[PDB]
Ligand binder design. Structure first.
Ligand SMILES: [Cl-]
Length: 207
């Protein structure tokens, strides 16, 4: 009998960090929903409460996934899990840097900017999203804050990749914690003046 892998590996925020980032996310959603520029462009996306719009919020603690394994059914799962760095890092505490919050018609999330140490724990898979073309490794790294009723949480990273592609290719408001950008097609990013730092434990989730 072989051993099951986790459902996924990743960085699981401490309860305090999780609560801090959730609160920040919610404040962002309330501020964006109330912003003139958002309300004006509501056609591409009475007023909309975005906390309600993103009705599926993650359970438990917030987390940033490295490798989704599906207990070993996902491509590259065993290959990822067998790495020394993964084993050595299992249970270890990290600090994650969050540089921006974003919204799309599908998801709400936080952009994680990995250290190169943390990048050692990022997977190197054969199948990459076409939206990840020409972006630095680990660009997909995110914390999902919410999504629409008919959307899967994994969409949040795809949405992030798409936003970063737009930013790579080359400002409608000033919020207290950063500058607000309208990227078109219902996409919005808050670029934080100060990166947000959260504490997290790298480990595996089985459910
Ligand atoms: Cl929480």
């Amino acid at each position: 009998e072989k051993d099951f892998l986790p459902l996924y590996f990743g960085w699981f925020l401490t309860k305090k960090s999780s609560e801090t980032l959730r609160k920040a996310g919610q404040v962002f959603l309330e501020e964006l929903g109330n912003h003139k520029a958002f309300k004006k462009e509501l056609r591409h996306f009475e007023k909309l409460e975005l906390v309600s719009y993103f009705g599926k919020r993650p359970p438990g603690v917030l987390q940033c996934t490295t490798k989704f394994c599906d207990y070993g059914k996902a491509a590259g799962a065993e290959e990822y899990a067998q790495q020394e760095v993964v084993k050595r890092s299992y249970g270890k505490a990290f600090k994650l840097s969050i540089s921006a919050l974003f919204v799309t018609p599908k998801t709400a999330g936080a952009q994680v900017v990995l250290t190169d140490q943390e990048l050692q724990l990022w997977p190197s898979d054969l199948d990459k999203p076409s939206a990840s073309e020409g972006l630095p490794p680990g660009s997909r790294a995110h914390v999902t804050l919410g999504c629409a009723a008919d959307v899967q949480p994994v969409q949040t990273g795809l949405d992030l990749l798409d936003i970063l592609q737009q930013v790579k290719g080359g400002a409608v408001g000033e919020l207290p914690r950063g500058k607000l950008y309208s990227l078109g097609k219902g996409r919005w990013m808050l670029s934080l003046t100060k990166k947000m730092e959260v504490k997290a434990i790298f480990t595996g989730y089985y459910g």
